[PDB]
DNA sequence: GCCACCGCTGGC
DNA sequence: GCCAGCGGTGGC
């Protein structure tokens, strides 16, 4: 994909950490869904926006 | 130029 | 129809 190399540790992760800013924003963690980004541990190390890592 | 949103839509 | 999560952008 555009933002996924599909081959790094972050790309292979299936579980959200539940503690980063992005996770806390999620409805599944009680957040408002205002940021709308993947867990920081799941941000592709090669392809993601530098500030998402 | 950056970042905290928010519009949008492919995939289900 | 919902929703994960990407791309664009207003306001700084
Ligand atoms: Zn997280
Ligand atoms: Zn990757």
Experimental approach was X-ray
CA A2 to CA A29: how far, in whole Å?
27
Please name the nucleotide lying closest to A16, CA to C1': C4
- Using the 8-state DSSP alphabet, how is residue A20 labeled? S
Conformational region of residue A14, where left means phi above 0, alpha means psi within -120 to 50, and beta covers everything else: alpha
Q: How far apart are CA A20 and CA A42, in angstroms?
A: 11
Domain boundaries, chain A: 1-53
> Does residue A28 approach strand B to less than 7 Å at its CB?
no
Q: ∠A44-A15-A53 over CA atoms, to 5°?
A: 30
- Resolution of the experimental structure, in angstroms: 2.1
Q: Is the CB of A36 under 7 A from strand B?
A: yes
- What gap in Å lies between CA A46 and CA A39, rounded to an integer? 15
Strand residues in chain A grouped as ranges (E): none
């Amino acid at each position: 994909s555009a933002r996924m190399c599909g081959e790094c540790e972050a790309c292979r992760r299936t579980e959200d950490c539940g503690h980063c800013d992005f996770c806390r924003d999620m409805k599944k963690f009680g957040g408002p869904n205002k940021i709308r980004q993947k867990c920081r541990l799941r941000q592709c190390q090669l392809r993601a926006r530098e500030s998402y890592k």
